[PDB]
Design a binder for this molecule. Sequence first.
Ligand code: MG
Ligand code: MG
Ligand code: MG
Ligand code: MG
Ligand code: MG
Ligand code: MG
Ligand code: MG
Ligand code: MG
Ligand code: MG
Ligand code: MG
Ligand code: MG
Ligand code: MG
Ligand code: MG
Ligand code: MG
Ligand code: MG
Ligand code: MG
Ligand code: MG
Ligand code: MG
Ligand code: MG
Ligand code: MG
Ligand code: MG
Ligand code: MG
Ligand code: MG
Ligand code: MG
Ligand code: MG
Ligand code: MG
Ligand code: MG
Ligand code: MG
Ligand code: MG
Ligand code: MG
Ligand code: MG
Ligand code: MG
Ligand code: MG
Ligand code: MG
Ligand code: MG
Ligand code: MG
Ligand code: MG
Ligand code: MG
Ligand code: MG
Ligand code: MG
Ligand code: MG
Ligand code: MG
Ligand code: MG
Ligand code: MG
Ligand code: MG
Ligand code: MG
Ligand code: MG
Ligand code: MG
Ligand code: MG
Ligand code: MG
Ligand code: MG
Ligand code: MG
Ligand code: MG
Ligand code: MG
Ligand code: MG
Ligand code: MG
Ligand code: MG
Ligand code: MG
Ligand code: MG
Ligand code: MG
Ligand code: MG
Ligand code: MG
Ligand code: MG
Ligand code: MG
Ligand code: MG
Ligand code: MG
Ligand code: MG
Ligand code: MG
Ligand code: MG
Ligand code: MG
Ligand code: MG
Ligand code: MG
Ligand code: MG
Ligand code: MG
Ligand code: MG
Ligand code: MG
Ligand code: MG
Ligand code: MG
Ligand code: MG
Ligand code: MG
Ligand code: MG
Ligand code: MG
Ligand code: MG
Ligand code: MG
Ligand code: MG
Ligand code: MG
Ligand code: MG
Ligand code: MG
Ligand code: MG
Ligand code: MG
Ligand code: MG
Ligand code: MG
Ligand code: MG
Ligand code: MG
Ligand code: MG
Ligand code: MG
Ligand code: MG
Ligand code: MG
Ligand code: MG
Ligand code: MG
Ligand code: MG
Ligand code: MG
Ligand code: MG
Ligand code: MG
Ligand code: MG
Ligand code: MG
Ligand code: MG
Ligand code: MG
Ligand code: MG
Ligand code: MG
Ligand code: MG
Ligand code: MG
Ligand code: MG
Ligand code: MG
Ligand code: MG
Ligand code: MG
Ligand code: MG
Ligand code: MG
Ligand code: MG
Ligand code: MG
Ligand code: MG
Ligand code: MG
Ligand code: MG
Ligand code: MG
Ligand code: MG
Ligand code: MG
Ligand code: MG
Ligand code: MG
Ligand code: MG
Ligand code: MG
Ligand code: MG
Ligand code: MG
Ligand code: MG
Ligand code: MG
Ligand code: MG
Ligand code: MG
Ligand code: MG
Ligand code: MG
Ligand code: MG
Ligand code: MG
Ligand code: MG
Ligand code: MG
Ligand code: MG
Ligand code: MG
Ligand code: MG
Ligand code: MG
Ligand code: MG
Ligand code: MG
Ligand code: MG
Ligand code: MG
Ligand code: MG
Ligand code: MG
Ligand code: MG
Ligand code: MG
Ligand code: MG
Ligand code: MG
Ligand code: MG
Ligand code: MG
Ligand code: MG
Ligand code: MG
Ligand code: MG
Ligand code: MG
Ligand code: MG
Ligand code: MG
Ligand code: MG
Ligand code: MG
Ligand code: MG
Ligand code: MG
Ligand code: MG
Ligand code: MG
Ligand code: MG
Ligand code: MG
Ligand code: MG
Ligand code: MG
Ligand code: MG
Ligand code: MG
Ligand code: MG
Ligand code: MG
Ligand code: MG
Ligand code: MG
Ligand code: MG
Ligand code: MG
Ligand code: MG
Ligand code: MG
Ligand code: ZN
Lengths: 141, 83, 110, 154, 59, 53
Amino acid sequence: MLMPRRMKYRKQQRGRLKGATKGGDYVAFGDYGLVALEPAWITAQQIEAARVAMVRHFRRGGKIFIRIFPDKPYTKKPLEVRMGKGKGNVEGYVAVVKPGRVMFEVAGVTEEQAMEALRIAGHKLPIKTKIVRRDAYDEAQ
Amino acid sequence: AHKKGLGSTRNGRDSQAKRLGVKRYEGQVVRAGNILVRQRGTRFKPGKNVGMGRDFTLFALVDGVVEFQDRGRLGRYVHVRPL
Amino acid sequence: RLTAYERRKFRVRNRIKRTGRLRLSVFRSLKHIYAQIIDDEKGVTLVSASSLALKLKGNKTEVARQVGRALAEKALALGIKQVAFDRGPYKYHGRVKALAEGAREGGLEF
Amino acid sequence: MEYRLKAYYREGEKPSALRRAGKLPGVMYNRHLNRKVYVDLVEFDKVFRQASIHHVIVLELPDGQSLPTLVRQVNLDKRRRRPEHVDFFVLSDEPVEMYVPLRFVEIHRDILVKVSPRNIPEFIEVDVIGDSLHASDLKLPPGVELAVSPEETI
Amino acid sequence: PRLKVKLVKSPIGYPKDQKAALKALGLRRLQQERVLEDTPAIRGNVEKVAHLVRVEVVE
Amino acid sequence: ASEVRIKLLLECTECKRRNYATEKNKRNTPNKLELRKYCPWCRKHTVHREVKI
RNA sequence: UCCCCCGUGCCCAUAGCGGCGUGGAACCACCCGUUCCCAUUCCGAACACGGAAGUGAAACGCGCCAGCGCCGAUGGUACUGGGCGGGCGACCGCCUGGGAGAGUAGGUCGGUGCGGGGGA
RNA sequence: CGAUCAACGGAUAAAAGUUACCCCGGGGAUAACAGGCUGAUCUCCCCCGAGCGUCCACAGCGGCGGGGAGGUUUGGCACCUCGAUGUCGGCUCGUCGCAUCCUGGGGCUGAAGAAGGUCCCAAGGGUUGGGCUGUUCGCCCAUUAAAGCGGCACGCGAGCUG
RNA sequence: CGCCUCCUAAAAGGUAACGGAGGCGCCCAAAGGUCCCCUCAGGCGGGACGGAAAUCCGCCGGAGAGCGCAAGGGUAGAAGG
RNA sequence: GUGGAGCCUGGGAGUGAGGGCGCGAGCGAUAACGUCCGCGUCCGAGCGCGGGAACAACCGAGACCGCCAGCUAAGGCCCCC
Ligand SMILES: [Mg+2]
Ligand SMILES: [Mg+2]
Ligand SMILES: [Mg+2]
Ligand SMILES: [Mg+2]
Ligand SMILES: [Mg+2]
Ligand SMILES: [Mg+2]
Ligand SMILES: [Mg+2]
Ligand SMILES: [Mg+2]
Ligand SMILES: [Mg+2]
Ligand SMILES: [Mg+2]
Ligand SMILES: [Mg+2]
Ligand SMILES: [Mg+2]
Ligand SMILES: [Mg+2]
Ligand SMILES: [Mg+2]
Ligand SMILES: [Mg+2]
Ligand SMILES: [Mg+2]
Ligand SMILES: [Mg+2]
Ligand SMILES: [Mg+2]
Ligand SMILES: [Mg+2]
Ligand SMILES: [Mg+2]
Ligand SMILES: [Mg+2]
Ligand SMILES: [Mg+2]
Ligand SMILES: [Mg+2]
Ligand SMILES: [Mg+2]
Ligand SMILES: [Mg+2]
Ligand SMILES: [Mg+2]
Ligand SMILES: [Mg+2]
Ligand SMILES: [Mg+2]
Ligand SMILES: [Mg+2]
Ligand SMILES: [Mg+2]
Ligand SMILES: [Mg+2]
Ligand SMILES: [Mg+2]
Ligand SMILES: [Mg+2]
Ligand SMILES: [Mg+2]
Ligand SMILES: [Mg+2]
Ligand SMILES: [Mg+2]
Ligand SMILES: [Mg+2]
Ligand SMILES: [Mg+2]
Ligand SMILES: [Mg+2]
Ligand SMILES: [Mg+2]
Ligand SMILES: [Mg+2]
Ligand SMILES: [Mg+2]
Ligand SMILES: [Mg+2]
Ligand SMILES: [Mg+2]
Ligand SMILES: [Mg+2]
Ligand SMILES: [Mg+2]
Ligand SMILES: [Mg+2]
Ligand SMILES: [Mg+2]
Ligand SMILES: [Mg+2]
Ligand SMILES: [Mg+2]
Ligand SMILES: [Mg+2]
Ligand SMILES: [Mg+2]
Ligand SMILES: [Mg+2]
Ligand SMILES: [Mg+2]
Ligand SMILES: [Mg+2]
Ligand SMILES: [Mg+2]
Ligand SMILES: [Mg+2]
Ligand SMILES: [Mg+2]
Ligand SMILES: [Mg+2]
Ligand SMILES: [Mg+2]
Ligand SMILES: [Mg+2]
Ligand SMILES: [Mg+2]
Ligand SMILES: [Mg+2]
Ligand SMILES: [Mg+2]
Ligand SMILES: [Mg+2]
Ligand SMILES: [Mg+2]
Ligand SMILES: [Mg+2]
Ligand SMILES: [Mg+2]
Ligand SMILES: [Mg+2]
Ligand SMILES: [Mg+2]
Ligand SMILES: [Mg+2]
Ligand SMILES: [Mg+2]
Ligand SMILES: [Mg+2]
Ligand SMILES: [Mg+2]
Ligand SMILES: [Mg+2]
Ligand SMILES: [Mg+2]
Ligand SMILES: [Mg+2]
Ligand SMILES: [Mg+2]
Ligand SMILES: [Mg+2]
Ligand SMILES: [Mg+2]
Ligand SMILES: [Mg+2]
Ligand SMILES: [Mg+2]
Ligand SMILES: [Mg+2]
Ligand SMILES: [Mg+2]
Ligand SMILES: [Mg+2]
Ligand SMILES: [Mg+2]
Ligand SMILES: [Mg+2]
Ligand SMILES: [Mg+2]
Ligand SMILES: [Mg+2]
Ligand SMILES: [Mg+2]
Ligand SMILES: [Mg+2]
Ligand SMILES: [Mg+2]
Ligand SMILES: [Mg+2]
Ligand SMILES: [Mg+2]
Ligand SMILES: [Mg+2]
Ligand SMILES: [Mg+2]
Ligand SMILES: [Mg+2]
Ligand SMILES: [Mg+2]
Ligand SMILES: [Mg+2]
Ligand SMILES: [Mg+2]
Ligand SMILES: [Mg+2]
Ligand SMILES: [Mg+2]
Ligand SMILES: [Mg+2]
Ligand SMILES: [Mg+2]
Ligand SMILES: [Mg+2]
Ligand SMILES: [Mg+2]
Ligand SMILES: [Mg+2]
Ligand SMILES: [Mg+2]
Ligand SMILES: [Mg+2]
Ligand SMILES: [Mg+2]
Ligand SMILES: [Mg+2]
Ligand SMILES: [Mg+2]
Ligand SMILES: [Mg+2]
Ligand SMILES: [Mg+2]
Ligand SMILES: [Mg+2]
Ligand SMILES: [Mg+2]
Ligand SMILES: [Mg+2]
Ligand SMILES: [Mg+2]
Ligand SMILES: [Mg+2]
Ligand SMILES: [Mg+2]
Ligand SMILES: [Mg+2]
Ligand SMILES: [Mg+2]
Ligand SMILES: [Mg+2]
Ligand SMILES: [Mg+2]
Ligand SMILES: [Mg+2]
Ligand SMILES: [Mg+2]
Ligand SMILES: [Mg+2]
Ligand SMILES: [Mg+2]
Ligand SMILES: [Mg+2]
Ligand SMILES: [Mg+2]
Ligand SMILES: [Mg+2]
Ligand SMILES: [Mg+2]
Ligand SMILES: [Mg+2]
Ligand SMILES: [Mg+2]
Ligand SMILES: [Mg+2]
Ligand SMILES: [Mg+2]
Ligand SMILES: [Mg+2]
Ligand SMILES: [Mg+2]
Ligand SMILES: [Mg+2]
Ligand SMILES: [Mg+2]
Ligand SMILES: [Mg+2]
Ligand SMILES: [Mg+2]
Ligand SMILES: [Mg+2]
Ligand SMILES: [Mg+2]
Ligand SMILES: [Mg+2]
Ligand SMILES: [Mg+2]
Ligand SMILES: [Mg+2]
Ligand SMILES: [Mg+2]
Ligand SMILES: [Mg+2]
Ligand SMILES: [Mg+2]
Ligand SMILES: [Mg+2]
Ligand SMILES: [Mg+2]
Ligand SMILES: [Mg+2]
Ligand SMILES: [Mg+2]
Ligand SMILES: [Mg+2]
Ligand SMILES: [Mg+2]
Ligand SMILES: [Mg+2]
Ligand SMILES: [Mg+2]
Ligand SMILES: [Mg+2]
Ligand SMILES: [Mg+2]
Ligand SMILES: [Mg+2]
Ligand SMILES: [Mg+2]
Ligand SMILES: [Mg+2]
Ligand SMILES: [Mg+2]
Ligand SMILES: [Mg+2]
Ligand SMILES: [Mg+2]
Ligand SMILES: [Mg+2]
Ligand SMILES: [Mg+2]
Ligand SMILES: [Mg+2]
Ligand SMILES: [Mg+2]
Ligand SMILES: [Mg+2]
Ligand SMILES: [Mg+2]
Ligand SMILES: [Mg+2]
Ligand SMILES: [Mg+2]
Ligand SMILES: [Mg+2]
Ligand SMILES: [Mg+2]
Ligand SMILES: [Mg+2]
Ligand SMILES: [Mg+2]
Ligand SMILES: [Mg+2]
Ligand SMILES: [Mg+2]
Ligand SMILES: [Mg+2]
Ligand SMILES: [Mg+2]
Ligand SMILES: [Mg+2]
Ligand SMILES: [Mg+2]
Ligand SMILES: [Zn+2]
């Protein structure tokens, strides 16, 4: 699954989840999209689970766009240790996702097929999601 | 009660803060010798009646009033205006 | 992109200006030589002299020495005594050097 | 084209108040004028969903003017996915850069074009893994200028 | 004109600079009323503690 | 300083007082240093020679 | 006072890059020479000196053009000092004062100080 | 000029260990038990439906992911207790929860019958005797309607054992 | 375990944790003073040996090179040669 | 801006275990009545008073003494009340 090929720094501080998404808020590529309603750290395994769900629904047909990338290192101390003694080991990668962000888009598939696929995908995510269709509003951005 | 072994950090170091920066602001009365700017490199350049020490420190050559001046590509300058 | 000519002109002039003296600047063309004493604080020229204005012709160096004397003559008259010599892009040699000699000869201090 | 839409003037009425009462705050401008306006959201939504930025919208102002505009800018609210603001660009005789839809007889839905307002088209035909075309080779119905680089891939 | 200023809500639990504003205005007890000149300096301190105070323009 | 980079004294050649401390790299500069230096006793510049510290 | 050229500053790309055009009387440049002063890690290219047959080709100056660069509103939004609420939380909302960035309209092929030479 | 006085404001010029034979002064300012807060881990229950089930997603199953509950595990934290809160297991004596082992009542079944699987309701009662080990647990023998799982300071040493 | 650089640090200074990352315990007689002169890396094109890269030529190239060593700041109108 | 403001000189100290909350971060697990800093606040020392069922630090509010008088604050107004 997804992760940065190389990095300038191995560990990043946790930081915040304030506000709406910076950008990525409009349909860019496909016809139908899945937009986040709540802020979260979406994991690489979560992203891949949603993608492969979509992939299976299409029987390899259609096109899938992933508009979030997990570049934030997720760190965790080994089990049953005490506080202190330096920062824990990097154990995975996450993508910071704030409300309004278009995480996924699909195209080249029927409306019924996109809707259901994007619905199944939403079930793999730890947040509430919405299904949207490309609009003049999108194309105007 | 089991106390599992822990590792360590190679990072603990950091150096003393150097209290860098402008020490006298525009319109302030200064006496000859007064330090105006502490800086790394020529973040600010000496102007009229202002000298620069070996460590880029700006100071007053005359009794006067400090004035700043922004000159674009030429840089930023600190002057002392005699009273 | 700057030329070695401009860099040299910027470099010696910048060094000159820092002293804060009146600036005796010298321009030297293929035919002529020009001198103007300048207050860089006011951006104003106080006194000038040139081969073209004095309508001198002849040995360029001898002409240079003369315009130097000329500059000084008008200079001391206006109360001007001290000055910093600005050779700009020019070596301190020949025509430029002769003019400086003339200004000194005339009673200028530098 | 073409579409028509009622518009009104505003001054110090708060944008939040306008939006709370079903109205979309906006501004209309060009080289000569600049005016603070608002349109009814539900009405605007009906027009823009067909007009977009491709087709002309005529603002019937309360003062009787019927001004020819193109939508230049629509600021969305990222959280709610609703329009917050509209930019109506007032057309005049001078040539304007705009986006003109493409019909394939696709990386580009439309294309950027510098065309006189009198001569504004509504179609541009494109005759049709991984073979494709580059805008340069396009139809170009009279009074029309490629406003991109011919290198651009369609 | 003058500003008639009344402390109606306790400064307890509020930042010290806000307590100091009350002192600049000479307000020491709750419900206390003071009539001060409407100068820009005085006005700034009244407005700092606007959430603690009631103000009426007088005369 | 180090073994290669040594400390040294500068002795005024005329009146023989040591007046200056400094260093050199005796691999790079194996010759005894000779430098003109103001000598406070002689009240004039004098050649100073390196002397063992 | 106004136009041109030569110096020299100031603002610091609205002054830049490119594409055109234009100028040699004057000024400036290239130019003609390398005896002389001076010079080249070799070279009179540069620095320098002595010149005045030639050309504005190069450079420079001055005009045009918005392809690029550079500048850039208004409106709206983010954020926020201060005052208040909401949510188990992650976080969200209101009041008052402040208010971007991006982008849209658009603007720019410079402006001006002092001295010198020439011209009306 | 001679300091890895580097534990770098540098106790002497000069210095390592052990104490279950231990002692005193103190600390719940600080660990081990138990409680508490937390719930990573643990136990349990869900959402999604990729696949399995000859056929058939959902009789019985549930990839990759998602959400919770409980507070019996190991821990994190160090909050009452170090002028003492006796620390495992057993025995005795109960009592409670229900996420039910059996008995009673059900729906579905890939339920012919009989006997099973799965889920729902149900805590009234019941839930054996032995071999091994200090053991809790576990394995084994012989049975049984069944040989349930957890709380009560890992219930109970001013009740016993040791 | 002392010292330097960056971040954490909440746009003055300062600010902690067995927080996230590095470096120092040297060096230079020129790598110091001053005067004079000079301008980079890189890219394309051209050229015997000759290469991705030696030295040579042209065009473009404001600084992305260089400044002994970490990092930051500064810097060609030089601190670089 | 006259305040138990401020500045100067000198005598006496105590303190150098803090804690909760709001906001801003680090560490932890976008755990802890968790831990470490920053700005503020309160308890500490206001375990005095009203409200929050009870309850240091939430809301209201700074208790010199007396009154069988009046107005309000948070919070309340069906009965306990
Ligand atoms: Mg953190
Ligand atoms: Mg996670
Ligand atoms: Mg983490
Ligand atoms: Mg740690
Ligand atoms: Mg960690
Ligand atoms: Mg996002
Ligand atoms: Mg979901
Ligand atoms: Mg729909
Ligand atoms: Mg323990
Ligand atoms: Mg234990
Ligand atoms: Mg280590
Ligand atoms: Mg420090
Ligand atoms: Mg620091
Ligand atoms: Mg400063
Ligand atoms: Mg100095
Ligand atoms: Mg000013
Ligand atoms: Mg600017
Ligand atoms: Mg000045
Ligand atoms: Mg003559
Ligand atoms: Mg001459
Ligand atoms: Mg000159
Ligand atoms: Mg109508
Ligand atoms: Mg929409
Ligand atoms: Mg709508
Ligand atoms: Mg456009
Ligand atoms: Mg209050
Ligand atoms: Mg309060
Ligand atoms: Mg309050
Ligand atoms: Mg407040
Ligand atoms: Mg303040
Ligand atoms: Mg009071
Ligand atoms: Mg009162
Ligand atoms: Mg204020
Ligand atoms: Mg010495
Ligand atoms: Mg040396
Ligand atoms: Mg000396
Ligand atoms: Mg002596
Ligand atoms: Mg020696
Ligand atoms: Mg000029
Ligand atoms: Mg000026
Ligand atoms: Mg041309
Ligand atoms: Mg021509
Ligand atoms: Mg030209
Ligand atoms: Mg000519
Ligand atoms: Mg001619
Ligand atoms: Mg010769
Ligand atoms: Mg030309
Ligand atoms: Mg433009
Ligand atoms: Mg062009
Ligand atoms: Mg802008
Ligand atoms: Mg604005
Ligand atoms: Mg605000
Ligand atoms: Mg606030
Ligand atoms: Mg606001
Ligand atoms: Mg406002
Ligand atoms: Mg504003
Ligand atoms: Mg802007
Ligand atoms: Mg954008
Ligand atoms: Mg606009
Ligand atoms: Mg123009
Ligand atoms: Mg321009
Ligand atoms: Mg100009
Ligand atoms: Mg012009
Ligand atoms: Mg000028
Ligand atoms: Mg003039
Ligand atoms: Mg004139
Ligand atoms: Mg004239
Ligand atoms: Mg040592
Ligand atoms: Mg020590
Ligand atoms: Mg020691
Ligand atoms: Mg020490
Ligand atoms: Mg120290
Ligand atoms: Mg000692
Ligand atoms: Mg000794
Ligand atoms: Mg010792
Ligand atoms: Mg011993
Ligand atoms: Mg023993
Ligand atoms: Mg023994
Ligand atoms: Mg004994
Ligand atoms: Mg013994
Ligand atoms: Mg003993
Ligand atoms: Mg004893
Ligand atoms: Mg003892
Ligand atoms: Mg004892
Ligand atoms: Mg004791
Ligand atoms: Mg404790
Ligand atoms: Mg301690
Ligand atoms: Mg303990
Ligand atoms: Mg024990
Ligand atoms: Mg314990
Ligand atoms: Mg304990
Ligand atoms: Mg216990
Ligand atoms: Mg414990
Ligand atoms: Mg207890
Ligand atoms: Mg829990
Ligand atoms: Mg839980
Ligand atoms: Mg868990
Ligand atoms: Mg459940
Ligand atoms: Mg079936
Ligand atoms: Mg099948
Ligand atoms: Mg599973
Ligand atoms: Mg979970
Ligand atoms: Mg849970
Ligand atoms: Mg869970
Ligand atoms: Mg418990
Ligand atoms: Mg525990
Ligand atoms: Mg603590
Ligand atoms: Mg104890
Ligand atoms: Mg006792
Ligand atoms: Mg006791
Ligand atoms: Mg006791
Ligand atoms: Mg006891
Ligand atoms: Mg014990
Ligand atoms: Mg029991
Ligand atoms: Mg049940
Ligand atoms: Mg049964
Ligand atoms: Mg039954
Ligand atoms: Mg059967
Ligand atoms: Mg049966
Ligand atoms: Mg059944
Ligand atoms: Mg029962
Ligand atoms: Mg029971
Ligand atoms: Mg036996
Ligand atoms: Mg037994
Ligand atoms: Mg056993
Ligand atoms: Mg046990
Ligand atoms: Mg066992
Ligand atoms: Mg049975
Ligand atoms: Mg048994
Ligand atoms: Mg336990
Ligand atoms: Mg027990
Ligand atoms: Mg017991
Ligand atoms: Mg006993
Ligand atoms: Mg026992
Ligand atoms: Mg007892
Ligand atoms: Mg007892
Ligand atoms: Mg025993
Ligand atoms: Mg015994
Ligand atoms: Mg700071
Ligand atoms: Mg300070
Ligand atoms: Mg190290
Ligand atoms: Mg050096
Ligand atoms: Mg040298
Ligand atoms: Mg090549
Ligand atoms: Mg060869
Ligand atoms: Mg560099
Ligand atoms: Mg290194
Ligand atoms: Mg007083
Ligand atoms: Mg006091
Ligand atoms: Mg006091
Ligand atoms: Mg006393
Ligand atoms: Mg103390
Ligand atoms: Mg202490
Ligand atoms: Mg302390
Ligand atoms: Mg405190
Ligand atoms: Mg503290
Ligand atoms: Mg502390
Ligand atoms: Mg807190
Ligand atoms: Mg709050
Ligand atoms: Mg931090
Ligand atoms: Mg705490
Ligand atoms: Mg906390
Ligand atoms: Mg915390
Ligand atoms: Mg505090
Ligand atoms: Mg105390
Ligand atoms: Mg209180
Ligand atoms: Mg207090
Ligand atoms: Mg209390
Ligand atoms: Mg109490
Ligand atoms: Mg107390
Ligand atoms: Mg209370
Ligand atoms: Mg109470
Ligand atoms: Mg309480
Ligand atoms: Mg209290
Ligand atoms: Mg408490
Ligand atoms: Mg409140
Ligand atoms: Mg008070
Ligand atoms: Mg009182
Ligand atoms: Mg009182
Ligand atoms: Mg009343
Ligand atoms: Mg009320
Ligand atoms: Mg009652
Ligand atoms: Mg009651
Ligand atoms: Mg009543
Ligand atoms: Zn001597």
